[PDB]
Amino acid sequence: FTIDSARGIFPNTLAADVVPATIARFSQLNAEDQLALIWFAYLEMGKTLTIAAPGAASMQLAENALKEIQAMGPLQQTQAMCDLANRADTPLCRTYASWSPNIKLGFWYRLGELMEQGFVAPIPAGYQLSANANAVLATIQGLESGQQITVLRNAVVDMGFTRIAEPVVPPQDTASRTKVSIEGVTNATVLNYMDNLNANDFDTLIELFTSDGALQPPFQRPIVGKENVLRFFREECQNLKLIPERGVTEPAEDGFTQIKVTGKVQTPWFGGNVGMNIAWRFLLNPEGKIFFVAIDLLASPKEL
Amino acid sequence: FTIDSARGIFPNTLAADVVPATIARFSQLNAEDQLALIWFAYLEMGKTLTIAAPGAASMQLAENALKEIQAMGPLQQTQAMCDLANRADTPLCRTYASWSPNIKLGFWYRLGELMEQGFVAPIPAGYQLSANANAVLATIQGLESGQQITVLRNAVVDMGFRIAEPVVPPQDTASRTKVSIEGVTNATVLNYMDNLNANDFDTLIELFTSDGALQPPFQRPIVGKENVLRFFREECQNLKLIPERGVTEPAEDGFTQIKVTGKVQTPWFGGNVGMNIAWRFLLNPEGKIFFVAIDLLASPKE
Numbered sequence: 028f029t030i031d032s033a034r035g036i037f038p039n040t041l042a043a044d045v046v047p048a049t050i051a052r053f054s055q056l057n058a059e060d061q062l063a064l065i066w067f068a069y070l071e072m073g074k075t076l077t078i079a080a081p082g083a084a085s086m087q088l089a090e091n092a093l094k095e096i097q098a099m100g101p102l103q104q105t106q107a108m109c110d111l112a113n114r115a116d117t118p119l120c121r122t123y124a125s126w127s128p129n130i131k132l133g134f135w136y137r138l139g140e141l142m143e144q145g146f147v148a149p150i151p152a153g154y155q156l157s158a159n160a161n162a163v164l165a166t167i168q169g170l171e172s173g174q175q176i177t178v179l180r181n182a183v184v185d186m187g188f189t190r191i192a193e194p195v196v197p198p199q200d201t202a203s204r205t206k207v208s209i210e211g212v213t214n215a216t217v218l219n220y221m222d223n224l225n226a227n228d229f230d231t232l233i234e235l236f237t238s239d240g241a242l243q244p245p246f247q248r249p250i251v252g253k254e255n256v257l258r259f260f261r262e263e264c265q266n267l268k269l270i271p272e273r274g275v276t277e278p279a280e281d282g283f284t285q286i287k288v289t290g291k292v293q294t295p296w297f298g299g300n301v302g303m304n305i306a307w308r309f310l311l312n313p314e315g316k317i318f319f320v321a322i323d324l325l326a327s328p329k330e331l
Numbered sequence: 332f333t334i335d336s337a338r339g340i341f342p343n344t345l346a347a348d349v350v351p352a353t354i355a356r357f358s359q360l361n362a363e364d365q366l367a368l369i370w371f372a373y374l375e376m377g378k379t380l381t382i383a384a385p386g387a388a389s390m391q392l393a394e395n396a397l398k399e400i401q402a403m404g405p406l407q408q409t410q411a412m413c414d415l416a417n418r419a420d421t422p423l424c425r426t427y428a429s430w431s432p433n434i435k436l437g438f439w440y441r442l443g444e445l446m447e448q449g450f451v452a453p454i455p456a457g458y459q460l461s462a463n464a465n466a467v468l469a470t471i472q473g474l475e476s477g478q479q480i481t482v483l484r485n486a487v488v489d490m491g492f493r494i495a496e497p498v499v500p501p502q503d504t505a506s507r508t509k510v511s512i513e514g515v516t517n518a519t520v521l522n523y524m525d526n527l528n529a530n531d532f533d534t535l536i537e538l539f540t541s542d543g544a545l546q547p548p549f550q551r552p553i554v555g556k557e558n559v560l561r562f563f564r565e566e567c568q569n570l571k572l573i574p575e576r577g578v579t580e581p582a583e584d585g586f587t588q589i590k591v592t593g594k595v596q597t598p599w600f601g602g603n604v605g606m607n608i609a610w611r612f613l614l615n616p617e618g619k620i621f622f623v624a625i626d627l628l629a630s631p632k633e
């Protein structure tokens with residue numbers, strides 16, 4: 028068993044690879060078209076889905092950068108946004124790249140509010156997308172909400188020129204914690220994984236892993252080793268709600284066990300308004316430690 | 332005008348972005364599935380489309396790596412190929428990454444022949460692709476040949492974790508052909524096409540502004556004469572550009588923008604694959620190339 032070979036467990040699992048396909052098409056676009064397309068997608072999505080407000084701490088971390096942009100003239104504001112989209116090498120792009128995804132998202136949330144108000148240069152009036160851009164937006168608007176928000180998030184995270192993160196919130200009080208139930212699955216490691224993540228208890232969660240174990244987020248390469256996985260939990264995985272439904276348990280090579288669970292996950296950005304269809308694919312060693320876990324965004328509810 | 336803003340000229344040009352979409356899907360796959368998928372695509376494509384043999388110089392440059400793999404036991408051979416697909420950090424992967432695209436392609440051409448012959452571990456008998464991988468292969472097989480070969484090339488180039496073929500002397504001046512483009516007599520555009528068709532990179536590069544850029548299909552702009560010239564020498568030998576028609580318009584600051592459409596042949600396939608291409612030029616007032624983008628078009632309808 029290697030981490031990279033483990034990526035192949037449960038090969039029947041149909042991931043929503045339209046997401047990275049769409050991000051790839053988006054990434055080809057002219058920067059102004061990238062910005063306008065997201066503006067359009069954002070505006071129309073906002074008619075039925077409300078984005079949660081960025082946290083106070085996140086806003087403080089992005090404040091300096093936001094103030095600099097607000098102080099610029101309109102042409103310069105537009106240029107700064109194009110710089111981010113083009114991944115140009117500028118001080119602002121370097122600052123942006125140092126930020127965790129949540130801080131990047133909160134930065135754009137605020138710019139969006141300011142553009143709506145006319146305090147930061149808006150997308151030009153009557154702007155029409157390029158041929159390729161119009162098709163990309165059409166694709167996005169045809170996707171399930173869980174896929175739409177993943178496309179938008181990944182586009183945002185990709186910006187800037189490549190560590191600052193929000194403070195780590197204390198774990199949930201033990202007596203207040205809920206426990207998940209999974210049809211077919213009573214495996215203690217899997218249950219403890221879900222329960223500890225739901226309680227933001229990253230120190231306990233990381234102890235479930237082998238020293239060389241990995242976690243693979245949707246459409247990303249495996250994050251390998253306890254140090255890197257713990258960093259990822261602390262920077263990116265706060266305040267999720269995992270709602271696993273059902274699973275299946277099978278023996279693997281060398282006394283290992285492989286378990287696939289399907290269910291839903293909510294991000295604090297949208298709460299119960301977007302339930303993403305997710306699979307977890309675990310490979311556990313003979314002692315029950317996590318050697319590998321992959322988290323996949325599923326192609327449709329037909330994959331649960 | 333910035334290089335990055337110039338990327339937006341002629342915005343109704345519909346590029347074949349199914350190519351980078353498909354590469355992105357492919358890149359998500361398990362490595363063994365990546366290898367099997369390409370094996371399948373390769374085998375089926377080869378029933379109607381023959382790949383030209385790698386050049387002698389290229390083969391010599393890849394020879395040591397190929398010999399090392401051939402000396403391995405079958406399990407190790409399979410692992411070595413998986414390492415390349417996974418972009419693992421290994422000596423072989425580092426050597427591979429140092430190679431120009433043509434050398435990487437020739438390396439896999441040879442491994443393909445050896446797998447067919449049974450001298451390098453083949454894809455396991457009766458191998459079945461994953462759900463996601465089967466769909467990716469279906470997409471590829473539905474594409475026009477020019478798009479298929481671009482997907483395969485880009486997948487190959489992406490593998491692994493400063494070595495190029497020797498530069499071939501430019502074509503004898505008296506032997507050179509000249510292109511004709513309906514609607515377009517612009518000397519810079521004509522000289523661009525004619526010099527590239529003659530492998531005359533030293534003359535070609537002089538058409539560019541010092542800070543000018545060239546943007547290959549689905550890649551970021553390559554900026555400045557040093558980098559553009561390097562790209563010509565490493566990657567752009569022995570092409571055949573067959574421009575057909577164009578359109579010429581004024582641009583800002585006394586600049587001119589010109590779009591040309593036509594076909595291009597790669598020496599890997601010759602006339603057997605004609606790729607539908609657009610060139611989008613932005614020329615300064617003196618006629619120098621500030622920006623040229625080369626796009627693979629979505630269909631002949633473009």
Ligand SMILES: CC1=C(/C=C/C(C)=C/C=C/C(C)=C/C=C/C=C(C)/C=C/C=C(C)/C=C/C2=C(C)C(=O)CCC2(C)C)C(C)(C)CCC1
Binds near residue numbers: 245303
């Ligand atoms: C840019 C831009 C603009 C603003 C755009 C904005 C404002 C976009 C905001 C988008 C947001 C807020 C998207 C949030 C999406 C969040 C998602 C998709 C979270 C998914 C998390 C999951 C699936 C986690 C699953 C996990 C599990 C279950 C595990 O078991 C282990 C950990 C982990 C893997 C993490 C404007 C409009 C100005 C126009 C100009 C350009």
Ligand SMILES: CC1=C(/C=C/C(C)=C/C=C/C(C)=C/C=C/C=C(C)/C=C/C=C(C)/C=C/C2=C(C)C(=O)CCC2(C)C)C(C)(C)CCC1
Binds near residue numbers: 367483566570
């Ligand atoms: C991996 C692998 C295998 C072998 C795969 C092989 C063997 C694949 C070979 C593929 C090849 C040989 C593809 C070649 C494609 C070449 C292309 C698509 C060239 C396009 C060039 C263009 C469009 C240039 C246009 C330009 C123009 C016109 C300009 O004006 C400026 C310059 C430039 C921009 C360059 C096997 C089976 C073992 C299985 C295991 C894994």
